[PDB]
Design a protein around this ligand. Structure first.
Ligand code: 6DB
Ligand code: 6DB
Ligand code: CL
Ligand code: CL
Ligand code: CL
Ligand code: CL
Ligand code: CL
Ligand code: CL
Ligand code: CL
Ligand code: CL
Ligand code: CL
Ligand code: CL
Ligand code: CL
Ligand code: CL
Ligand code: CL
Ligand code: CL
Ligand code: NA
Ligand code: NA
Ligand code: NA
Ligand code: NA
Ligand code: NA
Ligand code: NA
Ligand code: NA
Ligand code: NA
Ligand code: NA
Lengths: 253, 257
């Protein structure tokens, strides 16, 4: 019994690599814990974000564990296991800038249960970010969110990876970036991002949704195995433990 | 009773010498070495991050006491700062995308000392320079690599200078650059990361000359701190610590002698 799991490796603490390229993070530890429950040999591979879904359908590997949110558009092309996590997103800017004054600092809005307050916070941020350049990783729930609420207000610059937009924020090429808050909180702690800060509000639900294992639609048995393993790992505190270990928070839905 | 205290600056952008964990904790050969040297010196070790561009003005400006950021001793640097006895030596090479015609550069698997094999090194340089004609080569500005490129490849290649290794590596993978030149252990570690899939170390490896030896950067007249580091490095070289840490981090011996 063997399962090849693809991750990106550019999204710490979910998935990243050590100095010599060894894949590590919450999803690597989770993949191994799930495969132990499934009684299967676990092979974790790296695949760039852009080609992660065509390589799954192309059978280069069997599953995706790369902090992939379940979205109706993705559900048209691939299948998903039951969720193991949920995404919370926010903006980061250079802490010195006037943009650090973004309203709603640290306030959290669920796009599902607080649609009225979230759309007001979004409207305030959009007006506040008028004429700025915002970096985002292309083909993400974050680029979808920016396209939906900030398009004619902000100049949206899309990047292949988080690392790429973060370097353009620190050089001053970008005014702000939008990404998963745990990813940004980890990134701004790195020496290269000295001076960067999380600002304004945090958003969950809606576009961001929940994170699950990406699988081919026809792999019903593999989905059934992952579903039983995630249920069992949620039930014995395994996922919560790994989340606290990596994120110092609980990302479980 | 209480130990003295030293603040050591590193860059954090030069794995496996110095880099950081996902949450910014500084790690690598120089972090392990800094802590081992401070234990020998019986001093409290505080390791801080400082970008390469401002690393020397912040040392002279007394933001910290020492630099352990894989800094080579050069006559130009010796005019402005002091150095401890060396703890390592730099080996440099080019990296390109393996699919580039540039990957066939003469001659992979070879090493040339610019000090002892000057004749064979200049002959190999003359071949690489002609081979790289009209290409764009990325390099970290104010390094032994930028000095080496300025000396032998200026006028043959378009040299593009970057503030960090990570920046030129991203421009190599996007195709903005044809090649990069940097420390081979740094490039060998970098090409193993998912972002640098397809990149490869090509052509020969160079040591000595411009590259020289790595030592702790200190304020020019901070003689007590230099005396402290010199005794610790001597003791650390004597018990195999530097060789051990070198093998642990690079899987090659970087010690000079
Ligand atoms: C958990 C995260 N999901 C996003 C971004 C994931 C990008 N993953 C990666 N670069 N590895 C998505 O699936 O589009 C979020 O919404 O907060
Ligand atoms: C060891 C290395 N030294 C170079 C490059 C070091 C850059 N260091 C860093 N980015 N932390 C130099 O001192 O100019 C070398 O010559 O192979
Ligand atoms: Cl990484
Ligand atoms: Cl590693
Ligand atoms: Cl909710
Ligand atoms: Cl929590
Ligand atoms: Cl005291
Ligand atoms: Cl860390
Ligand atoms: Cl720390
Ligand atoms: Cl420290
Ligand atoms: Cl070296
Ligand atoms: Cl030219
Ligand atoms: Cl140019
Ligand atoms: Cl340019
Ligand atoms: Cl090497
Ligand atoms: Cl490629
Ligand atoms: Na925000
Ligand atoms: Na900013
Ligand atoms: Na020699
Ligand atoms: Na160098
Ligand atoms: Na610049
Ligand atoms: Na660097
Ligand atoms: Na050398
Ligand atoms: Na000195
Ligand atoms: Na002194």
């Amino acid at each position: 019994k063997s399962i090849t799991i693809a991750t990106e490796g550019g999204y710490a603490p979910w998935n990243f690599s050590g100095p010599g390229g060894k894949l590590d993070g919450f999803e690597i530890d989770l993949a191994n814990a799930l495969c132990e429950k499934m009684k299967a040999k676990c092979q974790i591979v790296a695949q760039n974000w852009d080609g992660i879904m065509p390589s799954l359908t192309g059978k280069k590997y069997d599953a995706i564990m790369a902090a992939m949110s379940v979205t109706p558009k993705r559900q048209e092309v691939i299948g998903f296991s039951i969720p193991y996590a949920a995404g919370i997103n926010g903006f980061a800017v250079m802490g010195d800038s006037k943009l650090a004054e973004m309203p709603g600092l640290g306030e959290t809005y669920s796009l599902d249960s607080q649609a009225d307050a979230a759309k007001k916070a979004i409207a305030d941020i959009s007006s506040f970010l008028n004429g700025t350049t915002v970096g985002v990783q292309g083909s993400t729930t974050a680029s979808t969110f920016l396209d939906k609420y900030f398009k004619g207000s902000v100049d949206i610059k899309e990047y292949k990876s988080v690392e790429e937009h973060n370097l353009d924020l620190t050089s001053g090429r970008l005014d702000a970036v939008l990404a998963n808050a745990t990813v940004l909180a980890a990134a701004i702690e790195k020496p290269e991002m000295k001076g960067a800060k999380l600002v304004g509000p945090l958003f969950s639900g809606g576009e961001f949704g929940v994170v699950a294992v990406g699988l081919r639609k026809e792999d019903t048995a593999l989905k059934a195995d992952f579903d039983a393993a995630i249920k069992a790992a949620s039930e014995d505190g395994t996922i919560k433990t790994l989340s606290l270990k990596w994120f110092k928070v609980d990302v479980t839905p």
